[PDB]
């Protein structure tokens, strides 16, 4: 079993290297990790947190679970990260979402795609939960329509592919739920609306939650592997950092 | 060392694939068989990655088939220092591929079975490994 995982990692790294060369010569489709299951098998997602979460993080983890139609919330009490991912890989889980907080304020969100990666790490800003809305009511859990706005660079396409495959393929044409990821200077605004087509246009009503997620790391491996080769990382102390755009 | 047999296998792959190139491209009969050949070679482990028929013409080589030999497989896995030592272990019956003991050094391991090549449970070689690590557990008889 350990030998199979070791062998497949070398194949995975070799495949990404060859794909990178193939992309470069074309410079002069769906990613390999998602190509096999794109449009066939619906995603299987586990939403978890860090150890000893606050109540607010638990509520936020519940909201993220409702965001993705095929997400399941799992309690992280004493679970060891290599054991966590190994358990998820056994159960056929496709993606793993871990949330961090600071005094009950969500700070980070990391997405790990199984069996071999990639792992994407985000930082959450301006988080507004639906628990902060009085008399909000329940959500609609239909397969939602997706909007990806202002993703142009190759990294932007990479981020769209990772986020796109967290949802089920083939929403109904008349589904009234829409989830939007709008990139505005590398700060991806995430909103959830329910729309009603009017006779002279469209009207939308916000459900929530609101939060801005900014990618700062993308590694070729599962989140257990701190030694995974880094596909892309955010440089903060370069002199152009205050104005450089990436997505 | 004679690679007569593997040359025939490599050649027969070339002659067969050439005949598929002759058959009209739109035919479903050729397309199915071409994929089966690629799947078979991929299963055998000759093709490390899924390839096209044109690649299959040149990727197939005698060295590729030699790499799949059990004693060569053991050498890369570091079970044996040298190929000749690997052959001796195979003949003496210290190696198992899955639940089956393989005493024929010529045996070619398939791609799926590569992960399960290991020493037999009661091998004296295996006891030497665990004794070196001081991890020898007598409940498992090894």
């Amino acid at each position: 079993m350990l030998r199979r995982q070791a062998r497949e990692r070398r194949e995975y790294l070799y495949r990404k290297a060859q794909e990178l060369q193939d992309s470069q010569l074309q410079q002069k489709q769906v990613d390999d990790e998602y190509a096999a299951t794109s449009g066939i098998m619906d995603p299987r997602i586990i939403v978890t947190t860090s150890r000893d979460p606050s109540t607010r993080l638990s509520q936020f983890a519940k909201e993220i679970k409702l965001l993705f139609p095929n997400a399941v919330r799992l309690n992280r009490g004493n679970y060891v990260m290599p054991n966590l991912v190994d358990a998820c890989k056994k159960s056929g889980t496709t993606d793993l979402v871990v949330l961090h907080e600071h005094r009950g304020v969500p700070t980070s969100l990391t997405i790990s795609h199984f069996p071999h990666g990639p792992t994407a790490q985000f930082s959450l800003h301006n988080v507004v939960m639906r628990h902060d809305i009085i008399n909000a009511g329940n959500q609609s859990e239909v397969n939602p329509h997706l909007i990806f706005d202002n993703f142009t660079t190759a990294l932007g396409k990479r981020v769209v592919c990772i986020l796109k495959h967290l949802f089920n393929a083939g929403p109904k044409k008349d589904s009234e739920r829409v989830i939007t990821f709008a990139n505005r200077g590398d700060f991806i605004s995430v909103r959830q609306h329910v729309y009603v087509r009017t006779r002279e246009g469209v009207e939308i009503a916000e459900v929530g939650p609101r939060f801005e997620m900014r990618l700062f790391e993308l590694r070729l491996g599962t989140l257990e592997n701190k030694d995974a080769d880094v596909e892309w990382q955010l440089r903060r102390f370069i002199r152009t950092a205050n104005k450089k755009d990436y997505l | 060392e004679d690679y007569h047999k593997y040359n025939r296998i490599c050649g027969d792959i070339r002659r067969l694939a050439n005949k598929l190139s002759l058959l009209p491209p739109t035919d479903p009969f050729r397309r199915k068989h071409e994929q089966l050949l690629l799947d078979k070679l991929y299963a055998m482990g000759v093709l490390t990655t899924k390839s096209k028929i044109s690649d299959l013409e040149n990727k197939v080589t005698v060295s590729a088939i030699c790499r799949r030999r059990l004693p060569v497989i053991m050498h890369r896995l570091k079970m044996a220092e040298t190929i000749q030592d690997a052959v001796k272990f195979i003949e003496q019956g210290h190696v198992r591929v899955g639940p089956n003991l393989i005493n024929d050094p010529a045996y070619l391991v398939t791609r799926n079975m590569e992960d399960y090549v290991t020493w037999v449970d009661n091998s004296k070689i295996k006891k030497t490994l665990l004794r070196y690590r001081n991890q020898i557990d007598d409940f498992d008889f090894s």
Partner: peptide
């Protein structure tokens, strides 16, 4: 070194695996 430790085959086999202060120094 970390990958090498990570991807170590437990079955790897090597034949090598089979194998007064002044007075003390003088005595030894």
């Amino acid at each position: 070194l970390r990958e090498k430790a990570k991807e170590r085959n437990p079955d790897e086999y090597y034949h090598a695996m089979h194998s007064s202060m002044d007075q003390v120094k003088l005595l030894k």
